[PDB]
Amino acid sequence: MVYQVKDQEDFTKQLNEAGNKLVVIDFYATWCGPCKMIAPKLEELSQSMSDVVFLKVDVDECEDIAQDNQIACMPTFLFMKNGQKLDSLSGANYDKLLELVEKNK
Amino acid sequence: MVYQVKDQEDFTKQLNEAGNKLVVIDFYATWCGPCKMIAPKLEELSQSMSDVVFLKVDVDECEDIAQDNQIACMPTFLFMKNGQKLDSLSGANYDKLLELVEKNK
């Protein structure tokens, strides 16, 4: 599953529940074409990779979180582990997403 | 000064008000760092150039306008003249922006 982050507190809770697992966070908007395009692929990946945590943040609903992460070009995928940033990807390039997951899991 | 488009009807009103002038529309978000950094430059261009009209659209306030113009990155600048789309620019590249303005005005 790809869990929808509710607010800053929820984001923190989810980053903790991940323990030592890679966390992939999709910063998106409902008005974003490329975002809607790649969302099903992220969901598919999440169903198989139980050792990676997949989250999504609607930038319209969590503007404070978007500002914290210097989001600009969507979808943006942020890669974190133990609450710390490892990498970031701008745009819906699925191959680059898989490469960064392989690298950081 | 850069006028903020209020809604879809307002967007047509501003496009009509521009007459024959090039219109530069800044699609932005209040959480967008690069958007904030370039906003004063746009204000200065707006104050200085009398043959170009500058508009801005807050994607959180006008999600429908963002979707309809297939916005993905921010800021995105849309260049219109007499109701026609001439060009688009993704990101806060001021030189490219200025190039497209000189080219299309």
Residue numbers in the entry:
A (entry chain B), B (entry chain A): 1 to 105
Please share text taken word for word from the publication where this structure appeared.
Litopenaeus vannamei thioredoxin (LvTrx) is a redox protein with a molecular weight of 12 kDa, which catalyzes the reduction of the disulfide bond in different biological systems. The determination of the crystal structures of LvTrx under different redox conditions discloses a dimeric form mediated by a disulfide bond and other residues that are involved in the dimeric interface.
During data collection, two crystal of LvTrx were diffracted at different transmissions, referred to below as LvTrx-1x (8% of transmission, 1.33 × 10 11 photons·s−1) and LvTrx-3x (27% of transmission, 4.14 × 1011 photons·s−1). The deterioration of the electron density was dependent on the increment of the absorbed dose. In the case of the crystal LvTrx-1x, the interface disulfide bond (Cys73-Cys73') remained stable, reaching a dose of 34 MGy. However, at a dose of 3.4 MGy, this disulfide bond showed double conformations in the Sγ atoms of the residues Cys73-Cys73' without compromising the disulfide bond formation.
